[PDB]
Design a binder for this molecule. Structure first.
Ligand SMILES: Nc1nc2c(ncn2[C@@H]2O[C@H](COP(=O)(O)OP(=O)(O)OP(=O)(O)O)[C@@H](O)[C@H]2O)c(=O)[nH]1
Ligand SMILES: Nc1ncnc2c1ncn2[C@@H]1O[C@H](COP(=O)(O)OP(=O)(O)CP(=O)(O)O)[C@@H](O)[C@H]1O
Ligand SMILES: Nc1nc2c(ncn2[C@@H]2O[C@H](COP(=O)(O)OP(=O)(O)O)[C@@H](O)[C@H]2O)c(=O)[nH]1
Ligand SMILES: COc1ccc([C@H]2[C@H](C)C(=O)N2c2cc(OC)c(OC)c(OC)c2)cc1O
Ligand SMILES: [Ca+2]
Ligand SMILES: [Ca+2]
Ligand SMILES: [Mg+2]
Ligand SMILES: [Mg+2]
Ligand SMILES: [Mg+2]
Lengths: 317, 62, 438, 422
C-alpha cells in the first residue's frame, strides 16, 4: 500500500489522478506536510525539490521535473532555443526577449513585410514596445478551416515518466476562434479562452471551440487529400522529441535520490504550406473535457503505478 | 581549454585548467554571555528551592 | 615547514579521528608504537608529514592532535586501543558526564568547566610549533558535545589565535543512523555560533555515506566502522597536500583562497570515487575518465543534492594514484560538454587539479578494496544549500510548537538564541540564492 | 559509571520491585547469593548501573526497600533473592498507612522519610556519577503513593540536578483494594507531574485485561499481573543495563522522549505476551496493538509524540527497520507529523529468559489522557459529595488541597489534548 500527498488543490488533472488513486483502495492520501509519502503532487510554484528523496525506506516520486521551466517560461524557452546547440531550427518563430539579454539592437536587424506579435499585436514596433515579455513574428498566413475561414491551434499532451520515456497522448484538440479571419479588430487574432471567454457567439462552426483529432483528420483527407499523421503529427513528434531530448541531461532523475514524471501541454500553429510551428510549452496543462477520464488514467498506468506496482493510449517517441 | 602553473615533483603534479574566463567577539563578551546563562540557572534553581520550602511549611502545617 | 593541530570533539569527532590517524600512519609508514623507520631524521625534521607529527628523542612520531569528549567511554578505547603508544596521555581529554544530546548543556553548563583545561592542552601543542597554521576540528553537528562544546572552543580559538586558520570536518545528521530527536536543534545552534569562526568546513551527511556503503560496499546495515573508514579516505584525500610534497593546497590558507570566495559560503561539496568492495571478487579497474565523471553523479557526493541546479564557485580535483594530466584534461573535455556545469559569471569556469602518485591506502582487512587510481573533488556549489533547507525545515517543524525547548532554557539559554540562530540560517539560505539562481 | 539508585515503597512497590531484581539478576548472572555465574561479559560491562560491588566481589543491588509496615518487607526477604539485598537497606515502620495518602505523605510517612533519606544519601554518596533515581510504587494505596511522592519531593531537594524516574502502578476498579484509590492517585499524579522527569504508567486495568482476554486466565492473581510488570520493567531498562550502540541513560531518555516537561507519562508495551519464536513482523504487529499496552489506552484515540522501541534477540536489524518503518507508514494517522524521527529503534543481541524474540516499547502518547480522565471521573463522583474525605481531614488535609489536585490533573488532560490536534 502506497502513500501520497496533494499540494496543488486547484489542478484539474491531478485532482482526478488523486481521486482515481484513492478509488483503487491501495493509496492513502496525507496532509500537505506529512514527510512520509511515496508520491507528491506538488505546488505549481517553488515546489521544494531539495527535500525529496531523503526519507529512509520511502521510494519518492513527484509529478514535476525540476528545471522544466527552461521549456515553459517563454523567456527561457527562447534563450534555450537560441543558446542550446541541439536547436541551431525552422519550427520556432523568429523571437526576441526584451526587458522593460536583452537584444533590442539585433531585434531590428531583420526589419526590412514585417508585422509581429508581443505578449507574455500590431505592425509598428512603437505600439507594443510601450507596454513598459517576448516578441515573435506573427503567422500572417495561417491555415484556415472551411467553411468558416477559421484559425486554430493544436494542444498535444506529452507525458515523461521517471525513465524519461516520452509519451505523446493519442488524443489532441483543435481550439478555433470560430469566426472568419481578417487583417489590419482583435477577436480571431487571439484564438482561445482568454480574449474569447470575456470578449468574444461562443462556438459557432464546431463544439465548445474544440475540434478533436478524428474530425480534423476527416477534413484534411476530404479538403486537402492528406492525413493528420503525415502533414502535421510527424512535425509535432519531431518538436516534442527535440525539446525534451535537449534538456534531458539537465532534468533527468535517473540517478537521483527522488524521481520525477511530468505532464506537458505543447501548443502548435499550422501555416498554409502545412508546416507545424511551436508556440509555447505548458508545464501545468488543463485537459480538454471529454479526455480527462482517459488521460488521467494513463498517467497512473505509466507514470505512477509503473513505480509503485499494484495487484495502449500513448505514442512512445 | 588552457593549462597553467604545471608543478611537478617526485610525489606528483598539480596544475590549473581554465575552460572560460569570468565577467571577532572579545573574551569579555564571551564571559558576559557565558555567565548570564549561569545566573539564569541559579535563578531557576532558587525558585525551585523556594517552592520546595513552601511545601515544607505546608507539610508542617498539615 | 608549518604545523597543523587537529582537535577531535565528541563521539563522532573522536571515532573519525581514530580512522584518520590510523590511515595517516599506514600512509606515512608509522607503526602502532610511533616508530617510523623510513624517517632518518631522528627526533626532528621540517618534512611534510612533520606538519601533522612531532617526533621525540626516542624516535616516536606523535599526532599533533587533541581528543576531547565530555564523557570517557569513547576516548578510553583510544587509551587502550591498537595505537595507545601513539598519543601522549595528556592528549586525550575526557570529562565525567556527557552533554545528554543537549547543545546548551555542552556549551553553557558542562562546557564552561573544561574549556580552560582544553585550551591549556591545545596551547601545549601550539608551543611545539614554529609556525602554526591553525586547526582541523572534527565533530558532529548532532551531539551535545559535538555541537555545543565545539562552538565554545571555536569562540575561544578565534581569541587566543586570531591569526590562525580553522577548518571543520562536520558530520551532518541523518535519520537512518541518528541518535537524538533534537539533532536539528543542535545543528542550527552550533552552525550559527560557529560560522564567523570557521574559515572552511567540509560537511559529511551520514545519509550519503550510509547509502554509499550500502550500494557500493554491498553492506546491508553499515556500522560506524564502515562509515568512518570511508570518511577516512575522503579526509585523507583532502589533507594529503598538507602532509606530502605538493604545490596545490599546501597550507590551510589555501583552502579558503582556492575554494571560498565569499566567507559565509564556506561549505565545499565533496565527491569521491571510486568506492569498491574488498570482497568484490572480479573487479574491472576504472579509468581516469571513468572516475572523473563519477565526481558529477549525485550518488557519489558526501551530501545528497543536485548540483545541476546551482552554480559553482570553484572546483578542485585531488587524485591519488596512476594519473597523468593528459588523461585528466581529456576526461574534463568530454565531461564539460555532456554535463550541466554552470559557474558563476564572476568566477573562471575551470578546475584546480592535484595528483599524488601514491595510490590510496586501505585498512588491511578493511571493507574497501585497493584501487589503482582515485579522485576526490572539492566543488563549492550553491546546490549544497539544499542540505540547509532540509535541516531548517526539520528545525521549523519542532520549534513551531516549541518542542523540547525547555531542555535548553533549563540549562540557562534563552528562546531568542533559537530564533536568532534560525534567522541567521534564513540569511545563509538567501545568500546561496543570490549567488545561484536568476 | 552512571549509577542508578532504586527505591521500592509500599506493598505494590516492594512486590513488583522484588521481581524486577529477580528478573534482571538472572539476566546478569547473579544468583540469589550475589555471586556471578555468567557466560558473557556483556552481563558485566554495565553492571554497576544497578549493582554495587561487595567485599567478597559479590553484587548487591543499589536498592532501598521502604514500607510503613513490615508485612510485604518480610515476605520479600523470604522470597527467592531475598538475601541479595543490603540488610541495612530495609527501612520500615510499624503502624502502616491504611490505604491513606495523607498518612503516607503528612503524618506516618513524615516520621519515617528522614531515615530513608539516610540510606539514599549513603547509597548516593558512593556513586562515581549518579544519573538519578528509579522508584517503584502504586498510586492507590498510602505508602507507595503518599510516602512515595514525599520521598520524591525530598530527593528533588537534596538532588535537584539528578533524574527522577518512577514505575507507577495506576488503580482500577477491576483490581481494587478500596474506594478511596482515586483520591490517593489524583493526589499522587499532581506530585508526579511536578517532580518527576519520566513516569511509566503501569495500569492495573490493562494488566488485568491482558491477563483475562489474551493470556487466557479467567481469574488472574497479582502474581500474573506482576509477571507482565517484570517483563516490561526488564525491557524498558535493557538499554540502560546492556552496552549498545545506544549509550542510553535516564537523562538522554528524558531529553529525547519528553517534548514538554509535564507530558512525561509513558505507555509501555511488550511482546510477546511457547517454542515458536515470533517473526519480526509479529513482534511489530503485537507491540503496537492496543492489546499489548501496559497502560489501558487505545493509541488509536490519540497520537504518539515520541516512541522508543527495543528488539531483544538475534534478528534481522534490516527487517526491524523494514517492519518498524512499515507500521508507521500504515498507521501514520497516530503519530505526530511535526517531530522529525520521533520513532527510535534499537536491537540487543541478548534475549530475556526463555524468549528468543521479544520487543519492548516506550510510548509518549496523548491517549494517556484517557487514563487521567478515568481517574478524574471516579474522583469527582465522590468529591462532589465530599464522601470518604473524613479519612483525610482527620490527618490534617483541607478540601482545598483536593480541589487543587483535581484542577492540576484536569489541566494535564487539557495539555495532552491540545497536542492531539496540532
Ligand atoms: N559518521 C559518523 N557519525 C557519528 C559517529 N558517531 C556519532 N555519529 C553521529 O553523531 C550524531 C550524534 O552525535 P555524537 O557525536 O554521537 O554526540 P557527542 O558529541 O558524543 O555528544 P553527547 O553524547 O551528546 O555528549 C549522530 O548524527 C550520529 O549518527 C561516528 O563514529 N561516525
Ligand atoms: N507566432 C504566432 N503565430 C500566430 N499566432 C500567434 C503566434 N504567437 C501567438 N499567437 C497568437 O497568440 C495566442 C497564443 O497565446 P500564447 O501561446 O502566447 O499563451 P499565453 O500568453 O496565454 C501564456 P499562458 O497560457 O501560460 O497563460 C493565439 O491565439 C495565437 O493566435
Ligand atoms: N499490579 C500490582 N498492583 C498492586 C500490587 N499490590 C498492590 N497493588 C495495587 O496497589 C494499590 C494498593 O496499594 P498498595 O501498594 O497495596 O498500598 P501501600 O502498601 O499503602 O503502598 C491498589 O490499586 C492495588 O490494585 C501488586 O503486587 N501488583
Ligand atoms: C524518540 O527519539 C529517541 C528516543 C530515545 C532515544 C535513546 C536515548 C539515547 C536513550 O536513552 N534511548 C532509548 C531508546 C530505547 O529504544 C530505542 C529504549 O528502550 C529500551 C531505552 O530505554 C532506556 C532508551 C533516542 C531517540 O532519538
Ligand atoms: Ca624527521
Ligand atoms: Ca508514629
Ligand atoms: Mg493553446
Ligand atoms: Mg558522547
Ligand atoms: Mg494493600
Amino acid at each position: 500500500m502506497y502513500t501520497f500527498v496533494v499540494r496543488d488543490e486547484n489542478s484539474s488533472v491531478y485532482a482526478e489522478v488523486s481521486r482515481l488513486l484513492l478509488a483503487t483502495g491501495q493509496w492513502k492520501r496525507l496532509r500537505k506536510d506529512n514527510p512520509r509519502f511515496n508520491l507528491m503532487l506538488g505546488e505549481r510554484n517553488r515546489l521544494p525539490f531539495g527535500r525529496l528523496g531523503h526519507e529512509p525506506g520511502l521510494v519518492q516520486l513527484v509529478n514535476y521535473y525540476r528545471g522544466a521551466d527552461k521549456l515553459c517560461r517563454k523567456a527561457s524557452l527562447v534563450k534555450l532555443i537560441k543558446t542550446s546547440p541541439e536547436l541551431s531550427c525552422t519550427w520556432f518563430p523568429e523571437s526576441y526577449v526584451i526587458y522593460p539579454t536583452d537584444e533590442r539592437e539585433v531585434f531590428l536587424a531583420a526589419y526590412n513585410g514585417n508585422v509581429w506579435i508581443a505578449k507574455s499585436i500590431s505592425s509598428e514596433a512603437s505600439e507594443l514596445l510601450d507596454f513598459i515579455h517576448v516578441i515573435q513574428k506573427y503567422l500572417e498566413k495561417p491555415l484556415l478551416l472551411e467553411p468558416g475561414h477559421r484559425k486554430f491551434d493544436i494542444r498535444s499532451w506529452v507525458l515523461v515518466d521517471h525513465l524519461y520515456n516520452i509519451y505523446l497522448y493519442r488524443e489532441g484538440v483543435l481550439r478555433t476562434s470560430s469566426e472568419p479571419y481578417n487583417s489590419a479588430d482583435k477577436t480571431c487574432h487571439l484564438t482561445n479562452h482568454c480574449i474569447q471567454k470575456e470578449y468574444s457567439n461562443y462556438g459557432r462552426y464546431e463544439e465548445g471551440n474544440e475540434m478533436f483529432f478524428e474530425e480534423f483528420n476527416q477534413y484534411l483527407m476530404d479538403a486537402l487529400n492528406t492525413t493528420l499523421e503525415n502533414s502535421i503529427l510527424l512535425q509535432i513528434k519531431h518538436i516534442i522529441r527535440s525539446c525534451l531530448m535537449c534538456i534531458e541531461p539537465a532534468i533527468s532523475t535517473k540517478h537521483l535520490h527522488y524521481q520525477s514524471f511530468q505532464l506537458f501541454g505543447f501548443d502548435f500553429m499550422v501555416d498554409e504550406e502545412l508546416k507545424v510551428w511551436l508556440i509555447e510549452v505548458n508545464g501545468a496543462p488543463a485537459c480538454a473535457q471529454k479526455l480527462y477520464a482517459e488521460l488521467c488514467q494513463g498517467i497512473v498506468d505509466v507514470a505512477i503505478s509503473s513505480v509503485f506496482p499494484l495487484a495502449s493510449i500513448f505514442i512512445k517517441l | 581549454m588552457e593549462v597553467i602553473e604545471l608543478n611537478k615533483c617526485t610525489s606528483g603534479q598539480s596544475f590549473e585548467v581554465i575552460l572560460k574566463p569570468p565577467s571577532d567577539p572579545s573574551l569579555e563578551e564571551i564571559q558576559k554571555k557565558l555567565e548570564a546563562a549561569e545566573e539564569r540557572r541559579k535563578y531557576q534553581e532558587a525558585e525551585l528551592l523556594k517552592h520546595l520550602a513552601e511545601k515544607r511549611e505546608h507539610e508542617r502545617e498539615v | 615547514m608549518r604545523e597543523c593541530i587537529s582537535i577531535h570533539v565528541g563521539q563522532a569527532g573522536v571515532q573519525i579521528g581514530n580512522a584518520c590517524w590510523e590511515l595517516y600512519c599506514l600512509e606515512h609508514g608509522i607503526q602502532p608504537d610511533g616508530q617510523m623507520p623510513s624517517d632518518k631524521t631522528i627526533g626532528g625534521g621540517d618534512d611534510s608529514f612533520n606538519t601533522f607529527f612531532s617526533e621525540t628523542g626516542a624516535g616516536k612520531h606523535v599526532p599533533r592532535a587533541v581528543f576531547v569528549d565530555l564523557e570517557p567511554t569513547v576516548i578510553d578505547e583510544v587509551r587502550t586501543g591498537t595505537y595507545r603508544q601513539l598519543f601522549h596521555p595528556e592528549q586525550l581529554i575526557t570529562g565525567k558526564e556527557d552533554a545528554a544530546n543537549n547543545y546548551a548543556r555542552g556549551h553553557y553548563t558542562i562546557g564552561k568547566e573544561i574549556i580552560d583545561l582544553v585550551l591549556d592542552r591545545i596551547r601545549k601543542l601550539a608551543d611545539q610549533c614554529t609556525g602554526l597554521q591553525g586547526f582541523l576540528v572534527f565533530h558532529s553537528f548532532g551531539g551535545g558535545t559535538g555541537s555545543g562544546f565545539t562552538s565554545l572552543l571555536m569562540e575561544r580559538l578565534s581569541v587566543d589565535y586570531g591569526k590562525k586558520s580553522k577548518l571543520e570536518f562536520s558530520i551532518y545528521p541523518a535519520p537512518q543512523v541518528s541518535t537524538a530527536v533534537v539533532e536539528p536543534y543542535n545543528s542550527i545552534l552550533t552552525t550559527h555560533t560557529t560560522l564567523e569562526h570557521s574559515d572552511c568546513a567540509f560537511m559529511v551527511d551520514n545519509e550519503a555515506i550510509y547509502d554509499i556503503c550500502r550500494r557500493n560496499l554491498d553492506i546491508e546495515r553499515p556500522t560506524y566502522t564502515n562509515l568512518n573508514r570511508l570518511i577516512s579516505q575522503i579526509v585523507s584525500s583532502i589533507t594529503a597536500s598538507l602532509r606530502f610534497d605538493g604545490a596545490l593546497n599546501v597550507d590551510l590558507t589555501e583552502f579558503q583562497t582556492n575554494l571560498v570566495p565569499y566567507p559565509r559560503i564556506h561549505f565545499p561539496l565533496a565527491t569521491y570515487a571510486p568506492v569498491i568492495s574488498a570482497e568484490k571478487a572480479y573487479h574491472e579497474q576504472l579509468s581516469v575518465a571513468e572516475i572523473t565523471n563519477a565526481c558529477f553523479e549525485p550518488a557519489n557526493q558526501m551530501v545528497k543534492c543536485d548540483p545541476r541546479h546551482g552554480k559553482y564557485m570553484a572546483c578542485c580535483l585531488l587524485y591519488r594514484g596512476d594519473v597523468v594530466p593528459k588523461d585528466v584534461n581529456a576526461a574534463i573535455a568530454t565531461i564539460k560538454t555532456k554535463r550541466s556545469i554552470q559557474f558563476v559569471d564572476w568566477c573562471p569556469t575551470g578546475f584546480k587539479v592535484g595528483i599524488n602518485y601514491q595510490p590510496p591506502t586501505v585498512v588491511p582487512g578493511g571493507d574497501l578494496a585497493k584501487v589503482q587510481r582515485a579522485v576526490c573533488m572539492l566543488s563549492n556549489t550553491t546546490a549544497i544549500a539544499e542540505a540547509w533547507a532540509r535541516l531548517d525545515h526539520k528545525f521549523d517543524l519542532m520549534y513551531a510548537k516549541r518542542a523540547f525547548v525547555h531542555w535548553y532554557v533549563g540549562e540557562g539559554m534563552e528562546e531568542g538564541e533559537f530564533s536568532e540562530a534560525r534567522e541567521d540560517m534564513a540569511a545563509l539560505e538567501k545568500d546561496y540564492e543570490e549567488v545561484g539562481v536568476d | 559509571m552512571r549509577e542508578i539508585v532504586h527505591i521500592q515503597a509500599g506493598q505494590c512497590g516492594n512486590q513488583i520491585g522484588a521481581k524486577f531484581w529477580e528478573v534482571i539478576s538472572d539476566e546478569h548472572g547473579i544468583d540469589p547469593t550475589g555471586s556471578y555465574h555468567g557466560d558473557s561479559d556483556l552481563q558485566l560491562e554495565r553492571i554497576n548501573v544497578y549493582y554495587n560491588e561487595a567485599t567478597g566481589n559479590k553484587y548487591v543491588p543499589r536498592a532501598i526497600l521502604v514500607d510503613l509496615e513490615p508485612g510485604t518487607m518480610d515476605s520479600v526477604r523470604s522470597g527467592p533473592f531475598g538475601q541479595i539485598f543490603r540488610p541495612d537497606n530495609f527501612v520500615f515502620g510499624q503502624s502502616g498507612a491504611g490505604n491513606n495518602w495523607a498518612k503516607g505523605h503528612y503524618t506516618e510517612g513524615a516520621e519515617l522519610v528522614d531515615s530513608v533519606l539516610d540510606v539514599v544519601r549513603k547509597e548516593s554518596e558512593s556513586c562515581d556519577c549518579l544519573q538519578g533515581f528509579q522508584l517503584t510504587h502504586s498510586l492507590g494505596g498510602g505508602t507507595g503513593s503518599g510516602m512515595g511522592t514525599l520521598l520524591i519531593s525530598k530527593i528533588r531537594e537534596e538532588y535537584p540536578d539528578r533524574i527522577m524516574n518512577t514505575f507507577s502502578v495506576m488503580p482500577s476498579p477491576k483490581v481494587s483494594d478500596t474506594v478511596v484509590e482515586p483520591y490517593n492517585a489524583t493526589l499522587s499524579v499532581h506530585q508526579l507531574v511536578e517532580n518527576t522527569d519520566e513516569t511509566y504508567c503501569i495500569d492495573n486495568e490493562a494488566l488485568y485485561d491482558i491477563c483475562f482476554r489474551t493470556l487466557k486466565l479467567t481469574t488472574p492473581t497479582y502474581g500474573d499481573l506482576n509477571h507482565l510488570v517484570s517483563a516490561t520493567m526488564s525491557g524498558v531498562t535493557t538499554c540502560l543495563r546492556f552496552p549498545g550502540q545506544l549509550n542510553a541513560d535516564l537523562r538522554k531518555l528524558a531529553v529525547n522522549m519528553v517534548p514538554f516537561p509535564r507530558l512525561h507519562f509513558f505507555m509501555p508495551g511488550f511482546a510477546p505476551l511457547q517454542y515458536r519464536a515470533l517473526t519480526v513482523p509479529e513482534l511489530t504487529q503485537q507491540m503496537f496493538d492496543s492489546k499489548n499496552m501496559m497502560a489501558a489506552c487505545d493509541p488509536r484515540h490519540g497520537r504518539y509524540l515520541t516512541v522508543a522501541a527495543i528488539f531483544r534477540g538475534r534478528m534481522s536489524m534490516k527487517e526491524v527497520d523494514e517492519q518498524m518503518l512499515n507500521v508507521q507508514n500504515k498507521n501514520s494517522s497516530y503519530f505526530v507529523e511535526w517531530i522529525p524521527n520521533n520513532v527510535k529503534t534499537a536491537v540487543c543481541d541478548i534475549p530475556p529468559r526463555g524468549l528468543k524474540m521479544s520487543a519492548t516499547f516506550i510510548g509518549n502518547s496523548t491517549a494517556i489522557q484517557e487514563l487521567f480522565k478515568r481517574i478524574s471521573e471516579q474522583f469527582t463522583a465522590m468529591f462532589r459529595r465530599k464522601a470518604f474525605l473524613h479519612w483525610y481531614t482527620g490527618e490534617g488535609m483541607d478540601e482545598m488541597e483536593f480541589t487543587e489536585a483535581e484542577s492540576n490533573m484536569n489541566d494535564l488532560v487539557s495539555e495532552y489534548q491540545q497536542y492531539q490536534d496540532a
